[PDB]
């Protein structure tokens, strides 16, 4: 299959027209092979404008969502980025081409091991895959300049937002029923202040649900 | 509520269609005046028909 | 079929062309753009104003018509057809009626058949007047639309006098046409037909042999027979290339067999040929309108609806006879049931083949109603058609394809 | 044309035995039910075969049948201007099953398959540009499935706070009314 | 050559100029609105109205056929037995921002209670002025009855 | 300032060029009770009205509406319309005024009708 | 007086030179076009089309507004210099119309932009739209100031 043509078409028609202007992001998405970062059974649909299912309750986000998500994080050459829920590592590979280094946190040992193999096979060396619970992050290498959460959340735990540098940026997809809002957060005076960025949908990550009990 | 229209009739069965030419009224219905009360009302236009008992002719 | 890397007759390769193309000249052509019909977002990649990539983004007028149709009866869905290729609404109603009539096995009265031909050709002129004269406006001619839309105004009055609406008639019904035409309306249609060729001459005098008009259309958007088969072309999009295909002749419907008209075809298959074909079709439609009015006058008085179990009775009968009142009550609430089955009914709509794929399941509502718009297939080919041309040619190419987005998006 | 369509159906059933599951001629139209694995080969044969020269792809659509093990039907409508005939091809597709793309045969199949993918959620393999074509960017769901609500789930509004057009959950001032008129009497089929 | 000669002498432009001047001095069909109006046939579908009988009683009997046929679900009706036992509505709303002005309701009405009238100049400054209630619709019928009745007579032979 | 109003405005009963045109080609057909004057040319081929006051198209009553819109051939002077005793006088569009129609629950009403569909128990 | 007569002059100039953006969404745009054609000649009122929002005073929302289109309509409205007026033309723009219960349609363009006049109809006739434009002129005369 000519995956290069499909990759170029994905950027032209799903990323560029969706208010993604950062050329570093466009350059990265034009170069990182998406099909190398999906399960083998999904290889032919790697460039479809939809979320790819990786494991039960986990997806590789749609190209529009990731393109816009990275464009608003506004990553710098000197940035250290935390990528929560890296799946097979596609997003980490894209961000690795912009930021200084990426700490990719994955919770499924099957996907964490595949991420290491696939990241190495693409000669990506500024990405460390750290295995553990998504809601914990990786506080060993904190603070981070930017945090990207690659799946829907209902709340972002304080433990996760404490690993954010002052002036750091966090982008998360929030789920309110059938509505999904991507919000961009800025750490100021120790508090992360969230603002609306755009609307997109993804399944809820395990460990980011909210406490919901009996209400009269 | 008072009736919008009263007609006095000498028959115990009347037809009402809204009195409008060539399909401009309501569906044509036949109404029976009870011998007890001596009047009936159209269910479409509310016109009241009242029997003239002295001249009321049985058919 | 990819010109993004420039190819020069001297074989030169620029240093920048060697680099991967990351910073391209991309421009939003529409939706708010005089040539974009309001709801076309075409993303163009330009290289010195040469169009190297055209990426139409549609759906800016997608309204979910096909979903909305599944919760309505067959009669309640008839007005949805008006609002697809809304320049000529009764022509789209016709496909819906034909599909229902085929599944129910219903025969419509003779007068209703003649009226359908009459107002279908009015719609063809309504469309071709809009297409040709706004196409002229796309290449800078200010005046043609003003002349053409005065004639459209008169035809929209003929619409209103038949059904009470200038645009969205809801006039063709499963089983015929809703109402009969007043005799004075037939006199006025005949009077209009006698004048109309004069306007066609005036538009022809202004445009056809104008050197500027020729330099904006001749050898622009050339379509070969093989291209037509790649992209599902129908209507003038194939006839301009010389294929004498017209559904009114190849797959006759209504009473078109007994009318006299000819099929204009082009020899070069470019924007100029398709303009000439549309002008000629307008003359042919005017002749059909004249024959239909003569046949209607020569007809004996008859009904315009099949009545029976498919259409409501007349109002006078409804107010007198018990059977008629029941049929009125039931057919305006539940409506007729359509036997289980699937049909595809197509007409030669003014913009090409318009069809309805109707899946009935024996109830009073469609199970699935797929609407086949000719403009959907025509617009899809704009990337192939526009590649290699200049930006100034784009509005002419959008015109020649005859796009209305009520039917592209549905 | 009825005898002609039955004769044509035998020709197809004979030459493409393994592709064709069955044929039907109803309401003057020939429908061919085909296997998913052989649909591309069959449509290619229909396009190129002398007797059946179906070189115009009229459209591709889908039909949802939630009561069926393979809930979707994908329907191909083809026209022959040279033979002056039409044909319909139907394949049954399960949810999450991939359908081979027809763009190799008909370049104009590209947008129709995007529409099926958008409105039904059926993915096509071998598609160069498979993305939503009619719904809003980032739309959730596939509206033409019978289990998607008519009004959907979300609606847009301009927010003065965000200075953006944002999505919100649907709130209807008047709820959709779905009248049920259908009579409990089928009627008779007289002989 | 003949075509090349005519282009050198600008004949195509001269013909256009002459045609333009013929239109220049010709009568204009423009209407002098609001003094002069376009033509309306008796069938014209305009603003809705609820009619009364010649005896002054309401024609509507709350059958709800108009509410059932309405393709846009623009009609909402509630009915009870009136104090005299008559079958009459207590609510009759038309959402004029949902209505498609198709005229199906007046076709479905068995008593000519709801009609689309000749009026089309009722643009409003606020949206809620287009949520017509029963009294608004009846007021339209009482003001436009004379023209509505004449139009019904004119189109009766075709209905 | 009467002449200036005629010279500078177009919403006061007629422009100056409408008046000249009416004088040249107008033939009076009748008057309505508001003082609007109706004219025709070519024996009713063209029909127009000169407004007494603001030129508001919704001021034309149903008495003349049919003639002015060519629905009926003959003017109400020659063929008056039959009126029922329960009919009400014509009103123009009242949208920008205090007489505009508003729904019963509108906040314009200043006594919006309170709605409910159940009766609540009241403690003794 | 000075200020009221100043506003009257401003309202006179703004009413007599009301330029509208070339912006039509659906079948309401067909009747809007007829309003500018010879039978009605909207331009004779000084109400002329302008391709660019930077030169437009009036937006006529003529057609269905879908969710996908709503941001684009808001953007070009935001790029109109002030004063800017909006006319909602037809059922779809007024309240959603025939597609009110759809998943992809804005149920009234006043959810996106403020509206000055609503013109009823599906479509309003070319004359009905012309009436609506003159009602906007009455509104400006009644309430127009230097701000709008
Ligand atoms: C040095 C020369 C170069 C040109 C000068 C510079 C340009 C100046 C700018 C102004 C341009 C004015 C354009 C005027 C066009 C008017 C219309 C036209 O050409 O005649 C067409 C019209 C006819 O239609 P109608 O009014 O419907 O007629 C019905 C009626 N029964 C009737 O016969 O009427 O018939 C009429 O309109 C008849 C009246 C004509 C009005 C005559 C005055 C025009 C102004 C000339 C200014 C000279 C300087
Ligand atoms: C008698 C006619 C004058 C002949 C003098 C020679 C002129 C040569 C001009 C030429 O050939 O180039 C045309 C040029 C070039 O056109 P072209 O693209 O055809 O190139 C000319 C090529 N030949 C001559 C070989 C066919 O025309 C233009 O640039 C467009 C003209 C602009 C619009 C003119 C409007 C005039 C209308 C008024 C006429 C009637 C008034 C009463
Ligand atoms: C002061 C100018 C006086 C002009 C009026 C003359 C009376 C004409 C009466 C008549 O029958 O005119 C017909 C036509 C109608 O015009 P109108 O009133 O717009 O249409 C209403 C239709 N119900 O009337 C017209 O078409 C009249 C159009 C008037 C145009 C006047 C132009 C004035 C000057 C323009 C610029 C001149 C430039 C300087 C040139 C210098 C060198 C010569
Ligand atoms: C040749 C040179 C021309 C110079 C430019 C002319 C344009 C400038 C003047 C504007 C036109 C007059 C105007 O603005 O009219 C307003 C007013 C209308 O008054 P009226 O309609 O009674 O009030 C409506 C209240 N909503 O106006 C009037 O009633 C007219 C009063 C005279 C005003 C003259 C300007 C001072
Ligand atoms: C009648 C209203 C007058 C209003 C003010 C007029 C302003 C005139 C501008 C200055 C004079 C320009 C003269 C242009 C040369 C005339 C061209 C011509 O008549 O072509 C023949 C042209 C032939 O066109 P054809 O009918 O398409 O062959 O004549 C006509 O059709 C009649 C037009 C005569 C115009 C003379 C009056 C000026 C207006
Ligand atoms: S005109 Fe049509 S959409 Fe409007 S209320 Fe009547 S039936 Fe409903
Ligand atoms: S207006 Fe007519 S159709 Fe509607 S409820 Fe009243 S009587 Fe029935
Ligand atoms: S209101 Fe009616 S005419 Fe206007 S855009 Fe909507 S469907 Fe078309
Ligand atoms: Ca009573
Ligand atoms: Ca290039
Ligand atoms: Zn009665």
From Swiss-Prot, chain C:
Gene3D superfamilies assigned: Cytochrome-c3 Hydrogenase, chain B
Q: Write out the entry's keywords from A to Z.
A: Cell inner membrane, Cell membrane, Membrane, NAD, Quinone, Translocase, Transport, Ubiquinone
A cellular component annotation (GO) from this entry: plasma membrane
User: Transmembrane region positions?
Assistant: none
Q: Which Pfam families match?
A: Complex1_49kDa
Source species, domain of life = Bacteria
The enzyme's E.C. designation: 7.1.1.-
Which reactions is this enzyme annotated as catalysing? a quinone + NADH + 5 H(+)(in) = a quinol + NAD(+) + 4 H(+)(out)
Q: What class of enzyme is it?
A: translocase
The record's section on InterPro entries has: NADH_Q_OxRdtase_suD (IPR001135), NADH_UbQ_OxRdtase_49kDa_CS (IPR014029), NDH1_su_D/H (IPR022885), NiFe-Hase_large (IPR029014)
Describe its membrane topology. Answer: Peripheral membrane protein
Compartment list = Cell inner membrane
Q: What is its main location?
A: membrane
Task: Report the sequence similarity comment from the record.
Answer: Belongs to the complex I 49 kDa subunit family.
Question: Assembly and interactions?
Answer: NDH-1 is composed of at least 14 different subunits, Nqo1 to Nqo14. The complex has a L-shaped structure, with the hydrophobic arm (subunits Nqo7, Nqo8, Nqo10 to Nqo14) embedded in the inner membrane and the hydrophilic peripheral arm (subunits Nqo1 to Nqo6, Nqo9) protruding into the bacterial cytoplasm. The hydrophilic domain contains all the redox centers. NADH-quinone oxidoreductase forms a supercomplex with ubiquinol-cytochrome c reductase complex (complex III or cytochrome b-c1 complex) and cytochrome c oxidase (complex IV), which stabilizes the NADH-quinone oxidoreductase complex.
Provide the protein name: NADH-quinone oxidoreductase subunit D
Swiss-Prot record, chain E:
* Membrane topology reported for the UniProt record: Peripheral membrane protein
Q: SUPFAM superfamilies in the record, alphabetically?
A: 4Fe-4S ferredoxins
Q: Which UniProt keywords apply?
A: 4Fe-4S, Cell inner membrane, Cell membrane, Iron, Iron-sulfur, Membrane, Metal-binding, NAD, Quinone, Repeat, Translocase, Ubiquinone
UniProt cofactor(s): [4Fe-4S] cluster
Annotated [4Fe-4S] cluster 2 binding lies at 70, 99, 102, 105
**Free-text remark on how the cofactor is bound:** Binds 2 [4Fe-4S] clusters per subunit.
Tell me its EC number(s), please: 7.1.1.-
HAMAP family with a match to the protein in the record: NDH1_NuoI
The protein here is known as NADH-quinone oxidoreductase subunit I
Species per Swiss-Prot/TrEMBL record: Paracoccus denitrificans (strain Pd 1222)
Q: Which gene encodes it?
A: nuoI
From Swiss-Prot, chain G:
EC number(s) from the headed UniProt entry: 7.1.1.-
Keywords, ordered alphabetically: 4Fe-4S, Cell inner membrane, Cell membrane, Iron, Iron-sulfur, Membrane, Metal-binding, NAD, Quinone, Translocase, Transport, Ubiquinone
Gene Ontology BP, a term: electron transport coupled proton transport
- Judging by the UniProt lineage, the source's domain of life is Bacteria
- Specify which residues bind [4Fe-4S] cluster according to the UniProt entry for this protein: 27-28, 92, 122
Localization of this protein: Cell inner membrane
> What does the entry comment about cofactor binding?
Binds 1 [4Fe-4S] cluster.
This protein's GO cellular component annotations are: plasma membrane; respiratory chain complex I
Q: Which cofactor is essential here?
A: [4Fe-4S] cluster
Topology in the lipid bilayer is annotated as: Peripheral membrane protein
Family (UniProt): Belongs to the complex I 20 kDa subunit family.
Provide the function of this protein: NDH-1 shuttles electrons from NADH, via FMN and iron-sulfur (Fe-S) centers, to quinones in the respiratory chain. The immediate electron acceptor for the enzyme in this species is believed to be ubiquinone. Couples the redox reaction to proton translocation (for every two electrons transferred, four hydrogen ions are translocated across the cytoplasmic membrane), and thus conserves the redox energy in a proton gradient.
Assembly and partners are described as: NDH-1 is composed of at least 14 different subunits, Nqo1 to Nqo14. The complex has a L-shaped structure, with the hydrophobic arm (subunits Nqo7, Nqo8, Nqo10 to Nqo14) embedded in the inner membrane and the hydrophilic peripheral arm (subunits Nqo1 to Nqo6, Nqo9) protruding into the bacterial cytoplasm. The hydrophilic domain contains all the redox centers. NADH-quinone oxidoreductase forms a supercomplex with ubiquinol-cytochrome c reductase complex (complex III or cytochrome b-c1 complex) and cytochrome c oxidase (complex IV), which stabilizes the NADH-quinone oxidoreductase complex.
Q: What is this protein called?
A: NADH-quinone oxidoreductase subunit B
Q: Which residues of the full protein are shown?
A: 28 to 175 of 175
């Amino acid at each position: 299959t000519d995956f290069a043509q499909r990759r170029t078409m994905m950027v032209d028609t799903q990323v560029r027209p969706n208010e993604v202007t950062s050329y570093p992001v466009i350059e990265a998405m034009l170069n990182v092979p998406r099909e190398q970062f999906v399960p083998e059974s999904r290889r032919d649909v790697a460039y479809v404008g939809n979320n790819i299912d990786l494991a039960p309750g986990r997806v590789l986000l749609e190209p529009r969502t990731l393109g816009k998500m990275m464009d608003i994080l506004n990553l710098q050459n000197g940035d250290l980025v935390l990528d929560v829920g890296c799946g097979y590592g596609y997003s980490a590979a894209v961000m690795a081409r912009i930021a200084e280094a990426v700490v990719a946190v994955e919770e499924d040992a099957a996907m964490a091991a595949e991420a290491e193999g696939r990241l190495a096979a693409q000669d990506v060396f500024n990405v460390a895959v750290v295995q553990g619970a998504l809601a914990e992050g990786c506080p060993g290498q904190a603070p981070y300049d930017a945090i990207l959460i690659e799946g829907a959340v209902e709340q972002v735990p304080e433990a996760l937002t404490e690993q954010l540098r002052e002036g750091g940026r966090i982008v998360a997809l929030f789920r309110e029923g059938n509505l999904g809002i991507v919000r961009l957060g800025h750490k100021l005076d120790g508090r992360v202040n969230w603002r609306f960025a755009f609307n997109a949908v993804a399944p809820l990550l395990p460990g980011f649900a909210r406490p919901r009990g009996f209400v009269l | 509520i008072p009736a919008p229209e009263i007609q006095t009739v000498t028959s115990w069965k009347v037809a009402c269609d809204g009195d409008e030419a060539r399909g401009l009224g309501h569906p044509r219905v036949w109404l029976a005046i009870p011998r007890d009360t001596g009047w009936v009302e159209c269910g479409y236009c509310d016109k009241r028909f009242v029997i003239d008992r002295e001249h009321a002719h049985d058919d | 079929g990819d010109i993004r890397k420039n190819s020069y007759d001297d074989g030169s390769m620029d240093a920048l062309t060697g680099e991967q193309s990351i910073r391209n000249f991309n421009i939003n052509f529409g939706p708010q753009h005089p040539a974009a019909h309001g709801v076309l977002r075409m993303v163009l990649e330009l290289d010195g104003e040469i169009v190297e990539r055209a990426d139409p983004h549609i759906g800016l007028l997608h309204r979910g018509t096909e979903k909305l149709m599944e919760s309505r009866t067959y009669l309640q869905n008839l007005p949805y057809l008006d609002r697809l290729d809304y320049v000529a609404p009764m022509n789209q109603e016709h496909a819906w009626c034909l599909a229902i009539e085929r599944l129910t096995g219903t025969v419509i009265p003779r007068r209703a058949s003649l009226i359908r031909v009459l107002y279908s050709e009015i719609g063809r002129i309504l469309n071709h007047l809009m297409g040709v004269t706004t196409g002229a406006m796309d290449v800078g001619a200010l005046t043609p639309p003003l002349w053409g839309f005065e004639a459209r105004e008169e035809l929209m009055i003929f619409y209103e006098r038949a059904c009470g609406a200038r645009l969205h008639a809801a006039y063709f019904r499963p089983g015929g046409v809703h109402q009969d035409l007043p005799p004075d309306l037939l006199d006025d249609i005949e009077e209009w037909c006698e004048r109309f060729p004069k306007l066609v001459d005036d538009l022809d005098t202004l445009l056809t042999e104008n050197r500027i008009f020729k330099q904006r259309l001749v050898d622009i958007g050339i379509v070969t027979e093989a291209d037509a088969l790649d992209w599902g072309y129908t209507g003038v999009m194939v006839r301009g290339s010389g294929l004498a295909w017209d559904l009114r002749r190849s797959q006759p419907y209504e009473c078109y067999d007994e009318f006299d008209f000819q099929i204009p075809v082009g020899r070069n298959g470019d924007c100029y040929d398709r303009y000439l074909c549309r002008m000629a079709e307008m003359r042919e439609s005017c002749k059909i309108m004249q024959q239909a009015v003569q046949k209607l006058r020569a007809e004996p008085a008859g009904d315009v609806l099949a009545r029976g179990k498919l259409t409501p009775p007349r109002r006078a009968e409804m107010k007198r006879d018990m059977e008629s009142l029941i049929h009125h009550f039931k057919l305006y609430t539940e409506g007729f049931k359509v036997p289980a089955g699937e049909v595809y009914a197509a007409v030669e709509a003014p913009k090409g083949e318009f069809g309805v794929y109707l899946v009935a399941d024996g109830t009073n509502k469609p199970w699935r109603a797929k609407l086949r718009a000719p403009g959907f297939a025509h617009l899809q080919s704009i990337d192939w058609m526009s590649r290699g041309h200049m930006l100034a040619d784009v509005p002419a190419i959008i015109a020649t394809l005859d796009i209305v987005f009520g039917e592209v998006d549905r | 044309s009825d005898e002609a369509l039955l004769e044509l159906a035998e020709h197809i059933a004979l030459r493409r035995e393994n592709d064709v599951i069955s044929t039907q001629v109803a309401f003057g139209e020939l429908t061919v039910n085909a296997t998913l694995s052989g649909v591309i080969g069959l449509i290619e044969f229909l396009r190129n075969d002398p007797n059946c020269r179906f070189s115009t792809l009229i459209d591709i659509t889908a039909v949802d049948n939630p009561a069926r093990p393979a809930r979707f039907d994908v329907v191909y409508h083809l026209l022959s201007m040279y033979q002056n005939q039409r044909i319909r091809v139907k394949v049954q597709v399960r949810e999450d099953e991939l359908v081979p793309s027809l763009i190799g045969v008909f370049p104009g199949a590209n947008w129709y398959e995007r529409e099926v993918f958008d409105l039904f959620g059926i993915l096509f393999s071998g598609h160069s540009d498979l993305r939503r074509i009619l719904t809003d960017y980032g739309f959730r769901g596939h509206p033409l499935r019978k289990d998607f609500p008519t009004t959907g789930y979300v609606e847009v509004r301009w927010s003065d706070i965000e200075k953006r057009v944002v999505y919100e959950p649907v709130n209807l001032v008047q709820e959709y009314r779905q009248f049920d008129f259908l009579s409990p009497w089928e009627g008779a089929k007289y002989v | 050559f003949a075509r090349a000669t005519k282009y050198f002498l600008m004949w195509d432009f001269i013909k256009g100029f002459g045609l333009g001047m013929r239109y220049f001095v010709s009568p204009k069909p423009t209407l002098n609105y609001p003094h002069e109006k376009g033509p309306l046939s008796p069938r014209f579908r305009g603003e809705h109205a609820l009619r009364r009988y010649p005896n002054g009683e309401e024609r509507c009997i709350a059958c709800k056929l108009c509410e059932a046929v309405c393709p846009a679900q623009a009609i909402t009706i509630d009915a009870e037995p009136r104090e005299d036992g008559s079958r009459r509505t207590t609510r009759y709303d038309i959402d004029m921002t949902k209505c498609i002005y198709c005229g199906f309701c007046q076709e479905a009405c068995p008593v000519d209670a709801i009609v689309e009238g000749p009026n089309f100049e009722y643009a409003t400054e606020t949206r809620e002025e287009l949520f017509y209630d029963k009294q608004k619709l009846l007021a339209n019928g009482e003001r436009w009855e004379a023209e509505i009745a004449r139009n019904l007579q004119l189109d009766a032979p075709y209905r | 300032m009467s002449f200036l109003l005629r010279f500078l405005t177009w919403w006061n009963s007629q422009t100056l060029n409408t008046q000249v045109w009416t004088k040249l080609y107008g033939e009076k057909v009748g008057e309505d009770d508001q003082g609007n004057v109706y004219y025709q040319s070519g024996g009713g081929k063209r029909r127009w009205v000169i407004y007494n006051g603001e030129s508001e198209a919704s001021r034309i009553s149903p008495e003349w509406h049919g003639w002015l819109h060519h629905t009926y051939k003959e003017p109400p002077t020659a063929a008056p319309l039959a009126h029922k005793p329960w009919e009400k006088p014509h009103e123009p569009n009242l949208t920008g005024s205090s007489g505009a129609y508003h729904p019963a629950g509108s906040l314009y009403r200043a006594q919006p009708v309170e709605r409910r569909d159940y009766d609540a128990w009241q403690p003794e | 007086f000075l200020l009221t007569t100043t506003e009257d002059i401003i309202n006179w100039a703004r009413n007599g030179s009301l330029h509208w953006m070339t912006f039509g969404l659906a079948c309401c745009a067909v009747e809007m076009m007829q309003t500018s054609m010879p039978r009605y000649d909207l331009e004779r009122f000084g109400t002329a089309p302008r391709a660019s929002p930077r030169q437009s005073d009036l937006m006529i929302v003529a057609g269905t507004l879908t969710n996908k289109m709503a941001p684009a309509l808001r953007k070009v409205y935001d790029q109109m210099p002030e004063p800017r007026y909006v006319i909602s033309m037809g059922s779809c723009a007024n309240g959603g119309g025939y597609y009110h219960y759809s998943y992809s349609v804005v149920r009234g363009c006043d959810r996106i932009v403020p509206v000055d006049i609503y013109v009823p109809g599906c479509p309003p006739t070319a004359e009905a739209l012309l009436y609506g434009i003159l009602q906007l002129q009455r509104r400006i005369r009644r309430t127009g100031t230097l701000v709008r």
